[PDB]
From a paper:
GK catalyses the rate-limiting step of glycerol utilization, with phosphorylation serving to sequester the sugar in the cell. Each domain is constructed around a βββαβαβα core that is characteristic of the sugar kinase/Hsp70/actin superfamily of proteins.
The crystal structure of PfGK in complex with glycerol was solved by molecular replacement using EcGK as a search model. The structure was refined against data extending to 1.5 Å spacing to give a final model that agrees well with the X-ray terms. The C3-OH of the glycerol forms hydrogen bonds to two water molecules that occupy a narrow channel to the protein surface. The pattern of interactions is similar to that in glycerol complexes of bacterial GKs. In PfGK, the β11-β12 loop (residues 227–238) corresponding to the glycine-rich loop in EcGK is well defined in the electron density maps. In contrast to the exposure of these loops in EcGK, in PfGK this loop is oriented towards the core of the dimer, an orientation that would sterically hinder tetramer formation.
Author numbering:
A (entry chain C): 0 to 501
B (entry chain A): 1 to 501
């Protein structure tokens, strides 16, 4: 008889389910991809019903498998984590989406952001929310929906719509109607006051959200999110949803970066570096976003973070695969062993613009330096190198904002962290010691932690921390400052070529 | 069955055509050879592979004809070839001292920069018809001299032969004749464009200390020798009677004989030539002054201005190698199905930019991609890039010729069958395009030269009617505002590619 924690990670490219035992070993896991719809230049959508169907199927297969291995199974609780910013507006009473999800990676609102940015003081927006206007957060997507679909406008006005991130969507469906979010996801909307942790009336007005009742209640990360009641997942009847957090913040909890100054970097569909700033709100002057790291309980002061976001990483590799430049993602290590340099090819991976720290939504993905000798392999390597170069820019902003000369370690996680030549190149270019987590799925691990803590599986966070801090690999820089400066100059000139106004 | 053998030793393959005396193709076949691109900038061919392929093609074709006809007589052989590509070999043994270094090779970029600084570039243009560049033979010869002491020593002692592909073919087929023709000699950077002789000052600049290693320059219709190679026994004592570089051959095959007439061939590269009559025209807009043809020794040559584009078919081949297209065949459907490029621009500068900008520092670059971009958009961008480059050349040509517009551009090549591609071309270059009826006008040109030399026909005037036949005309369907926009978008991309940072 087996107690387990279900951790759902509804990620950008796929939905993942993880069943953890109470020693935080994975006893079953699986995933299903869902369509990445890119209809037009800059558009990026998901089908919200496809996501739910995939979720239900994965939950049902998982309990079946477990009930096959074990004598009885007890699901103690459910934690939810998710791709952030992605937004769905749906009908409250029926649950019917009024439009597809518009994903974080969508950039159709470039024109709107240019328009609004000229009308508002960017420092005032940043003080309120933690960010300048951008194409990335939910708010301009919501605005676009309201401007382009009068049904949406009408139903926000009359309070018959719900505006939600993916976490809100999942909980609403599982619970048959609860409307909740958590402070980490709310901080990704451009609608929350970053200091007070409440929906901000002024921001709502800017974005034409005329009836704030359509917004879900903002909860702490460990909370009573409700009981599963969906008839699609009958074995899960009355199992409580007890933790909820945005994916990249989830990875902070899974990496145990709980002390001020500790930093992690997750390599996934995008790459996301967060540093814990303790209870102090730190506002960047270098292109980083101020966000909520976590707030476990209602009476806790939140821990804050500075975040550097990169949009093209795994999403780039996926693009390469679709367009036949790579036969399979698994090859990327072998490609980097065999292909020792790119023969000066540079790939500025800007398919959805540049995010942190330059924030140029007018950037597009660009390849430079090719000759007849250039092969697929070199193009693939150059895209991977471009991840590292972008991360280096982020690290430079972070050290400036933090008033430090270096990070002592960067804790890293993700599939790509198993690719030794890639991680070595990252360590070389960012000039930072990198410690790779033992767990790669640290996102799902953080959600299982929060859910378990909420139902007292363990007494305290302190009983799980030594477990969490485990590492299996370390990288140090092996690259000369001469060589590094030369490579970073090459990158910098290719970014200039990509950005110059002509 | 009396036939003319026309050999087209092209960049990517070797083709043989047997023509009857009415210029009908009775048999043809081809074989590819390796495009060796070992390092960035490097582009080589195996000279022995080319010869082996040609002998197999010749032997198979005469087997086919003698299976089909009761008696076969090969009246004569014409040779045409990829230009600029150079091979240095031992005179006695015929052994190559190094691979062919192809016209597309750009390893000499640093030397060209050095020499362009040291010498007066207008003087080089006045002498030879071109500025220093990575394209013509001479820098490649100089690189071999500087990097291979055996080549240096065999030039100095007069035991090597320095030859373009025509010279190489004729040397092997004849067991030793060392000949070139006027058109190929003009592609070396070593010939005086006015006197049509090897220039001692040029040879000095390129460290060619002994001019005896260079072949005799002949007219295009000439006695190039009799076939003697034991590898092609059935061809024993058949005369080789025409020889011309490929792009010039396409001039003959398109009947571009009058002053101001122009053609454009689409192949591995794209090459526009305009006949300037007996006048030598020096460009101020990046075009090269070349010889169009000189049939007999007595004739004043006909000159041309030429705009050369490196990445065309060579670009398609790269796309194919890198899995961005599954077969070349698909370009048309790609362009039908793909009505625009998602705003993507591909500056196809794998070996730098050739005419009219002549920037050896340029590299192939792709701009404007989003997650919506697909292979097909990138393919179509490369193809659009051909047309944008052609437009720049047409602009240079109308300036140099002192005209407002070309009346018509006669086009040939496999790409010219692709209606959406040709229509894009005609839109962007804003020039009427007339497509030749004949698909291998390069080989036709050599067949005409070879057969004229052995007097198969009364005159060139008898064959001209057949040569002029066209089957399609394109005119621009694009409005000036949309043309100006697109050309502005290309120009900004090129500027991004070229800005010195």
């Amino acid at each position: 008889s087996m107690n387990v924690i279900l951790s759902i990670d509804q990620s950008t490219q796929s939905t993942k389910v993880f069943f953890y035992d109470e020693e935080l070993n994975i006893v079953h896991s699986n995933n299903l991809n869902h369509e990445q719809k890119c209809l037009k230049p800059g558009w990026y959508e998901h089908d919200p019903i496809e996501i739910m169907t995939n979720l239900y199927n994965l939950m049902n297969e998982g309990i079946k498998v477990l009930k096959d291995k074990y004598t009885s199974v007890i699901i103690k609780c459910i934690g939810i984590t998710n791709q952030r910013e992605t937004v769905i507006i749906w009908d409250r009473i029926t649950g019917k989406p009024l439009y597809n999800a518009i994903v974080w990676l969508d950039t159709r609102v470039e024109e709107l952001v240019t328009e609004f940015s000229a009308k508002y003081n960017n420092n005032d927006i940043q003080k309120k929310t933690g960010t300048y206007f951008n194409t990335y957060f939910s708010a301009f997507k919501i605005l676009w929906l309201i401007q382009n679909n009068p049904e949406i406008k009408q139903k926000i006005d009359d309070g018959t719509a719900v505006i939600g991130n993916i976490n809100t969507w999942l909980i609403f469906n599982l619970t048959k109607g609860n409307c909740y979010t958590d402070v980490t996801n709310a901080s990704r909307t451009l609608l929350m006051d970053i200091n007070t942790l409440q929906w901000d009336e002024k921001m709502c007005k800017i974005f034409n959200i005329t009836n704030m009742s359509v917004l879900p209640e903002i909860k702490s990360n460990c909370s009573n999110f409700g009981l599963v009641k969906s008839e699609h997942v009958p074995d899960y009847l009355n199992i409580p949803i007890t933790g909820c957090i945005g994916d990249q913040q989830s990875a902070c909890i899974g990496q145990a970066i709980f002390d001020e100054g500790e930093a992690k970097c997750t390599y996934g569909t995008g790459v996301f570096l967060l540093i814990n700033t303790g209870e102090k709100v730190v506002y960047s002057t270098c292109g980083l976003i101020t966000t909520i790291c976590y707030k476990f309980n209602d009476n806790d002061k939140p821990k804050y973070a500075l975040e550097g976001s990169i949009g093209t990483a795994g999403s780039g590799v996926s693009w390469l695969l679709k367009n036949k430049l790579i036969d399979d993602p698994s090859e990327a290590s072998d490609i980097m062993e065999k292909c020792e340099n790119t023969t000066g090819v540079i790939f500025v991976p800007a398919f959805s613009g540049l995010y942190a720290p330059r924030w140029r939504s007018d950037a597009r993905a660009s390849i430079y330096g090719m000759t007849f000798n250039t092969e697929r392999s070199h193009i693939v390597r150059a895209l991977l190198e471009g991840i590292a170069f972008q991360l280096n820019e982020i690290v430079d902003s972070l050290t400036s904002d933090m008033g430090i000369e270096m990070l002592h370690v960067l804790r890293c996680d993700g599939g790509m962290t198993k690719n030794k030549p890639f991680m070595q190149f990252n360590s070389d270019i960012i000039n930072t010691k990198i410690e790779v987590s033992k767990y790669k799925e640290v996102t799902s691990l953080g959600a299982a932690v929060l859910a378990g803590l909420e139902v007292k599986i363990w007494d305290s966070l302190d009983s799980v921390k030594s477990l969490l801090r485990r590492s299996d690999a370390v990288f140090h820089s092996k690259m000369d400052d001469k060589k590094r400066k030369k490579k970073t100059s090459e990158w910098n000139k290719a970014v200039e070529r990509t950005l110059i106004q002509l």
